[PDB]
Amino acid sequence: PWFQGVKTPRALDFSEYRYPVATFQPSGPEFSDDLIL
Amino acid sequence: PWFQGVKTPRALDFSEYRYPVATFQPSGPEFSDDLIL
Amino acid sequence: NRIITVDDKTSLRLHYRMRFYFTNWHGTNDNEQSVWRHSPKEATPLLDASSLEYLFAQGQYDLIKCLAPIRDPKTEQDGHDIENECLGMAVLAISHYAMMKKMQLPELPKDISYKRYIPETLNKSIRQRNLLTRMRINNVFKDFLKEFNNKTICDSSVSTHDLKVKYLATLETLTKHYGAEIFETSMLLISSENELSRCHSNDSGNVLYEVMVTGNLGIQWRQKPNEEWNNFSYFPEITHIVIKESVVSINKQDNKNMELKLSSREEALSFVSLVDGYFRLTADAHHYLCTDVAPPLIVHNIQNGCHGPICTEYAINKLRQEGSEEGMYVLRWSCTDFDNILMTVTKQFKNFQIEVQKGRYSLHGSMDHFPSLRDLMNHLKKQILRTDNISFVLKRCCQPKPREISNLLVATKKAQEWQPVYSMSQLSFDRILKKDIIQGEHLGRGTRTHIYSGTLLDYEKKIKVILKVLDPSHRDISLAFFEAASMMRQVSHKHIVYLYGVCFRDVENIMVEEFVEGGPLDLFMHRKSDALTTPWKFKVAKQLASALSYLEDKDLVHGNVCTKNLLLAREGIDSDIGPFIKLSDPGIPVSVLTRQECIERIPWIAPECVEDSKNLSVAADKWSFGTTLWEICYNGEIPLKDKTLIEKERFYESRCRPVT
Amino acid sequence: CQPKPREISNLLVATKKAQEWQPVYSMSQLSFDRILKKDIIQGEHLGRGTRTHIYSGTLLDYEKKIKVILKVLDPSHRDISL
Ligand SMILES: Nc1ncnc2c1ncn2[C@@H]1O[C@H](CO)[C@@H](O)[C@H]1O
Incomplete structure (x- = not known):
């Protein structure tokens, strides 16, 4: 029965691609010095 | 080559049906008699 | 309107085909919206039952005779799949023939062969292949037929009507660009006349282009490949078409233009007829675009006033809107007979049948006849009619209206x-804060209105505008002011001035408008009286006509179409560049004017508005445009001057022609 | 600084x-529905608000003969019509 039918899976093709977000770029300075009145 | 593949035509199924308009129903009276002043 | 002559020597063969087509008329394909006729207050099907049979035969002939092109494959798999689907289509057609013949497949297998049911090229291609493939495809066709003819018919209970729609739907997607016509030309010009632009687009290259017209998309064009189409316009957007020898020109409502050349005059007429036919089906059924291809029946209807094969309910509904007074009537062609007209007269709604034969018109039930329908109506006008216990006299006829919706x-x-x-009762406008405007010097006085120069800030910056202020002593008509401001907000045309909004400041109300520096057209016509030329006048008239047409399409009413409300944006007297004009705001409506002030607007104001102010409608503009045309040709001379008010009233009262 | 209700962010x-x-x-649009002066009927006085007068009334042909409240701006304070 099934030997008479050969067909490639419909989900094995690809088109139009996709993409996630990569990451956030770390950055932070610091120049904190305190004084009291 | 083609002897290894048997598939029914995709267009041979039917679903949801269709319908045209039938016709208009004829009707018309007449009671015309004229007079002159 | 082409005339065919027979002189005992000519011989020709023609075909009676269905030309106009809308894709996806059937609802089977759910991926796109269907199409339907309008119905009086489900959706009416587009096609009649009888027409579907002839359309089916036409499609079958087109497919079998290879007149339509079959789609080319994109690989081997679909290259075999298309042949498989064509074989399935042949199965469907032969099954339809067998069912309509009222006999089963085993009853008449003598004439069965799939060769007569595929495009000739596909038959030729198969003939060149091996015999084993022929035997196998014969077996597959026979098995498919045996399965469909016994299992499917009981599984789905498909009737004779059921298979035709499926056949047509399948042919719609199996065929390349079905239901469309494509033309080829070597020259193509597209023009636009934006302010100070006059952009002559395109180039003088030797490349070739193609133009395609279809029902659901309109007009599209592109360069022939050695690319996606770009849209030009849809049918309701067109205004008129003109033929210059063998060059066809198309003109749109926004003054854009298209011009192209074809092989000969016959090709030009063939091209124009398609667009003219589509316009009637989609936009308005009581109009024709080009004088050279007008069908005689539409011309006759326009001359006499008969409607098309409209439904009875619409005719009944129309009479109700006119007060249903005795003596009013409607004419319309019968929905079944090619020679009868249903005079519906009015409460009671009586019908009458007029028989038309070989150009002779006569009322049914009488022996006297007349050579013209208008003559028959005129004779019937003065008699008194008798039916049952009621007698009445006809007084006036009803006429169609532009873009009137119907089936x-x-x-x-x-x-x-x-x-x-x-927008039956909504009043909407934009507010401008009192801190953004600066009032300037006095400029003059209008009709109960004062005008000042001014500047608008922070909208660029420091832009110059015109400020119109209602008079303090006439605040009772503030509703009219708001109505005019709301009306001006909806329009967007290149020949109408732009309205920024309305500013509230204490008790005052101010309208802020664009500034045009050329001044009124009247004064310019007064000063340059000797230098004006005919093409200048025609160019001026065309733009005003286009603007009024745009206002008509949106069912708005402008009551002051005159020379005083025409502003010059560019003189154009000096060189080839033409003049450019804009139309001002409606101003104070006539509805709030006294009896005397209505007289002074003769002959600009329509007579029915003088009779009763409530009768104002869109038709009043066509009178003022006619008066303005006369005003233009005589260098702004005052029409009907030196006449007193009583003489002016007598002019309207006696139905005399005012100007010639 | 503090967050706000339904503040849009990532x-x-x-x-x-x-x-x-x-x-x-609706930054600057002013829109409302017009009622024709022939469809309202003014009734008796009901009292006074903040620079506003209130009367009973009836609206016709909107059913028919429905009862409504009419609020009228004071004549001496028309500057605040905005
Ligand atoms: N809508 C308008 N646009 C531009 N100028 C106008 C307009 N209405 C009146 N004017 C100006 O008013 C003066 C004549 O009343 C001219 O300077 C004219 O330009």
């Missing part, structure tokens, strides 16, 4: 967006 | 269903 028109998704919006 | 996720719940922009 003649066909609704489509693209045309759906062109429908007018409902 | 934390929120946009969807088709939630798209319809977004507020509409």
